[PDB]
């Protein structure tokens, strides 16, 4: 009764598509096609990703990437269009806001194949921010806009997109975090290995240039974390670049003052996030995950894209100026929680999307 | 110091718009220009006549792309245009009209953070399945500056959240061009002498579209009507040899005998005939605009036009070809009408206004 073709580029997009698929594959009368724009990866770490996160095997890998925006986008546009002319789907789903997303939407729309944009209406309002142009043009190219927030809805209305193409469904990444959260609790040994209890540690990740490329900020961070560790163990899966910078700056020994690890796989990282007493991070994605698992977050930046998390008191900016102050900030936010309300849907965004598709 | 302004063009109407802008840019200190054509160089006779008569410069680049699907053409043009932008490093990219070339140019530039100005911004049919509608929308939302032809286009842009400070009402550079080529036609074209015609002593017909040329009922209505008009006032009908044979085939060749049926004429000869006609009968959107520019009443043999403003100012009139008697009467009646004396598409100096805005910023 309906053929639904998903275009995905980067890993976040596979995760969103997998969540939607978990609903679509339960729907009798839906045929699904998964088009990956990039290459297959045979490496062990990659195979584990697809397997442990239950990602469907793509029907296509177009192999495109490594070039400029114009080469990657233009080749994807032609190649995706080739697939659409063979598969003739009733719907094309595009996800996130990369060049793959835009290429998928532009390929479909000129063939008059209805396009639905999963994660529509996000705006930085900075036309030069990486994904801002992709966000705007994907949204204006699409037939259905699945917004994660009311702010995104309003963003879309403001640009003259009509209300009847806009549907507030929430963030499928919340759905995915609940699914992987349950699976981690079943499968992950990371807390057993480290000898840690649920709610008995702080998780830290640091990888942004603003922190890792400044000798002074990185010293402040690492010293602050070493001080926090004395009170509550600090688990710090250190990004390899962060490690490299620490070592070059002569800051290596501080990592010996916390539980410093090599990066861990996805399910192990979910297990650490959901069971942390608090998360300290400069990652935008990790800030959202903290909220999804109702774990207080301290963001070691002077700003964040997710102001809604600050307003809801789940997240808290802590610029790394002084090690004592940062440590004390973290220790204090450890005993806070934010507003128990939903910012990004109820974890069932996937069913709401499917409902508008299976019509 | 100076600005490098690179123009992307992909269809003949874009060449005309860019040349009009360029006639101003090249007289203005502090500008270097680069012209990129997405398609091929041609050496047939009619193409050479296009470039020579309409004063179109040979592009600095011909990307040689065309003839494929939307995805093929657009995707290849996007990569190929970007290549040129990385070499030329312009300060501004200008894109024109609303074709796949336009969009490819805008998208190539915007991801390099090269300012884009869209000439002919804000047009909307409000039907996202009309040919160029997605192109219009996406080009508009990709652009840094929007050069709107009408107040309507300005409102369309504001209604999609584009702020007033990026929208400039300049008019339609096609009007500038029509005045340029009109003056040139009056200096150079001898077509009226050649035909023994007097200015305002004839009707011009041009029938281009398949909905008409390929349906024997509609084509008969048109040619039967014209042959009727011809008994009161000469009808000049430059007919493509295709459309001529299509008419011979449907059995209508005696009608082409009655009127002054011609082989295709050159561009300036057509301009000369248009501007000096008592009335123009056409199914071409472009000709409908030229009729208005030259203040010649127009009758459009279709059930619709996009250019509704011409209908509402009474310069144009829809007469779908269902009834030869009534079509002939409509022509005879409308050839003694005029529209409302109003400028719909600017003052004929849209090019100067674009140039002034670009050179300022
Ligand atoms: Cl993504
Ligand atoms: Na609640």
């Amino acid at each position: 009764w309906v053929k639904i073709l998903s275009v995905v580029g980067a890993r976040p997009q596979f995760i969103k598509a997998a969540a939607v698929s978990r609903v679509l594959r339960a729907s009798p009368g839906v045929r699904e096609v998964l088009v990956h724009t990039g290459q297959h990866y045979d490496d062990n770490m990659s195979q584990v990703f697809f397997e442990e996160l239950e990602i469907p095997d793509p029907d296509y890998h177009l192999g495109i990437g490594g070039g400029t925006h114009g080469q990657n986008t233009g080749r994807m546009l032609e190649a995706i269009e080739g697939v659409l002319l063979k598969e003739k789907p009733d719907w094309v789903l595009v996800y996130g806001n990369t060049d793959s997303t835009l290429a998928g939407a532009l390929a479909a729309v000129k063939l008059h194949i209805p396009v639905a944009h999963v994660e529509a209406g996000l705006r930085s309002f900075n036309r030069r921010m990486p994904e801002e142009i992709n966000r705007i043009l994907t949204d204006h190219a699409s037939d259905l806009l699945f917004a994660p927030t009311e702010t995104a809805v309003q963003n879309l209305l403001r640009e003259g997109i009509p209300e009847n193409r806009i549907h507030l469904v929430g963030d499928v990444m919340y759905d995915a975090a609940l699914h992987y959260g349950a699976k981690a609790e079943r499968k992950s040994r990371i807390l057993e290995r480290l000898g840690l209890q649920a709610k008995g540690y702080v998780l830290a990740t640091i990888h942004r240039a603003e922190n890792t490329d400044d000798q002074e900020r990185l010293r402040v961070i690492l010293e602050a974390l070493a001080e926090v560790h004395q009170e509550v163990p600090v688990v710090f899966p250190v990004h390899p670049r962060t490690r490299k910078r620490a070592e070059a700056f002569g800051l290596g020994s501080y990592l010996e003052k916390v539980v410093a690890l090599e990066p861990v796989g996805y399910l192990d990282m979910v297990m650490l996030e959901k069971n942390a007493r608090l998360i300290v991070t400069d990652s935008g994605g990790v800030q959202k995950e903290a909220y999804f698992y109702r774990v207080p977050c301290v963001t070691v930046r002077e700003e964040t894209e997710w102001v809604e998390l600050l307003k809801a008191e789940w997240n808290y900016l802590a610029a790394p100026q002084n090690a004592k102050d940062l440590a004390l900030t973290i220790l204090h936010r450890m005993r806070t929680k934010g507003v128990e309300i939903d910012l990004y849907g109820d974890g069932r965004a996937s069913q709401k999307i499917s409902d508008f598709l299976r019509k």
Side-chain angles (χ1 to χ4, degrees), chain A residues 2-43 45-246 248-357 359:
Chain A
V2 72
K3 178 182 248 184
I4 299 179
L5 184 156
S6 293
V7 176
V8 302
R11 289 194 174 173
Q13 293 177 25
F14 274 110
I15 292 164
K16 298 177 171 67
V20 170
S21 169
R22 282 196 286 283
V23 176
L24 296 183
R25 93 170 39 92
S27 253
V30 176
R31 298 108 72 193
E32 286 195 272
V33 181
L34 180 56
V35 173
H36 179 221
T37 60
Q39 70 172 104
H40 195 264
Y41 296 101
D42 292 301
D43 60 293
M45 183 159 109
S46 295
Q47 288 172 302
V48 164
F49 179 87
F50 286 89
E51 193 243 70
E52 92 176 356
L53 295 196
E54 306 172 358
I55 306 308
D57 276 330
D59 297 292
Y60 303 75
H61 295 262
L62 303 183
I64 296 164
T68 62
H69 288 294
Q71 296 157 333
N72 292 345
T73 307
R75 289 171 188 199
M76 280 191 295
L77 176 48
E78 177 167 353
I80 297 162
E81 188 196 53
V83 173
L84 300 187
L85 285 174
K86 187 190 171 215
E87 290 286 355
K88 301 137 108 77
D90 297 296
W91 279 99
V92 166
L93 268 32
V94 300
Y95 299 84
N97 296 277
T98 68
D99 295 350
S100 303
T101 319
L102 173 63
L106 233 191
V109 68
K110 296 305 194 62
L111 299 173
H112 299 162
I113 299 168
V115 172
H117 189 202
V118 180
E119 194 183 69
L122 293 183
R123 298 290 184 276
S124 68
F125 292 122
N126 186 338
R127 315 206 101 229
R128 290 146 156 176
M129 183 250 132
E131 296 189 353
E132 189 76 351
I133 294 304
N134 289 338
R135 292 159 165 204
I136 295 161
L137 299 182
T138 302
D139 290 336
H140 287 275
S142 302
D143 299 285
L144 283 180
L145 294 311
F146 294 120
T149 66
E150 186 59 25
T151 297
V153 169
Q154 293 302 315
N155 289 345
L156 294 167
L157 291 174
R158 187 177 307 113
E159 294 180 12
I161 296 168
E163 179 269 349
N164 58 15
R165 295 193 330 234
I166 309 171
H167 303 297
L168 175 53
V169 296
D171 187 351
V172 301
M173 290 309 282
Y174 187 29
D175 305 18
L178 295 178
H179 184 78
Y180 299 140
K183 181 171 189 181
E185 285 304 333
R186 283 200 290 114
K187 294 199 86 77
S188 173
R189 285 171 66 205
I190 188 81
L191 302 193
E192 172 211 44
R193 167 203 169 189
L194 300 179
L196 289 182
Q197 212 103 247
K199 305 308 168 202
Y201 63 95
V202 163
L203 178 66
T205 81
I206 294 288
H207 76 240
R208 287 210 74 113
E210 63 181 279
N211 295 315
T212 62
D213 292 358
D214 172 336
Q215 308 195 112
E216 183 67 27
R217 294 172 56 132
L218 188 58
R219 187 276 301 164
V220 166
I221 295 169
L222 295 192
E223 186 176 350
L225 287 183
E227 293 181 17
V228 174
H229 179 71
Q230 289 303 313
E231 286 300 80
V232 50
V234 168
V235 179
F236 187 5
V238 184
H239 186 299
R241 195 169 98 266
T242 299
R243 193 172 293 261
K244 190 167 145 58
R245 297 274 184 286
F249 293 158
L251 287 172
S253 309
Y254 272 105
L255 292 184
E256 298 173 6
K257 298 300 180 205
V258 296
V259 186
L261 304 173
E262 292 301 306
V264 303
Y266 193 105
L267 280 181
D268 286 337
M269 186 60 182
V270 164
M271 188 64 175
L272 291 169
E273 293 170 326
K274 75 186 302 290
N275 284 299
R277 193 180 322 182
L278 174 141
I279 291 168
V280 181
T281 191
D282 64 4
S283 160
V286 174
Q287 285 163 64
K288 280 225 185 191
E289 299 302 325
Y291 166 69
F292 296 159
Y293 296 128
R294 301 291 195 277
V295 171
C297 192
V298 163
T299 292
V300 179
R301 307 192 57 216
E302 290 166 296
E303 69 178 357
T304 174
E305 177 152 37
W306 317 121
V307 302
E308 61 266 23
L309 294 179
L310 301 179
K311 298 275 193 167
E313 288 188 313
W314 278 111
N315 189 18
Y316 190 85
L317 295 180
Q321 194 279 314
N322 169 281
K324 166 173 130 89
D325 291 343
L326 175 58
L328 289 186
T329 290
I330 289 168
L331 287 176
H332 304 168
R333 297 300 303 184
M334 228 177 17
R335 290 172 265 281
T336 62
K337 287 176 135 275
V339 174
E340 176 50 51
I341 201 150
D342 275 318
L343 288 175
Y344 302 119
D346 62 355
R348 294 155 182 107
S350 300
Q351 184 68 61
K352 293 176 202 166
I353 290 164
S354 170
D355 283 337
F356 286 109
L357 290 188
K359 195 146 283 175

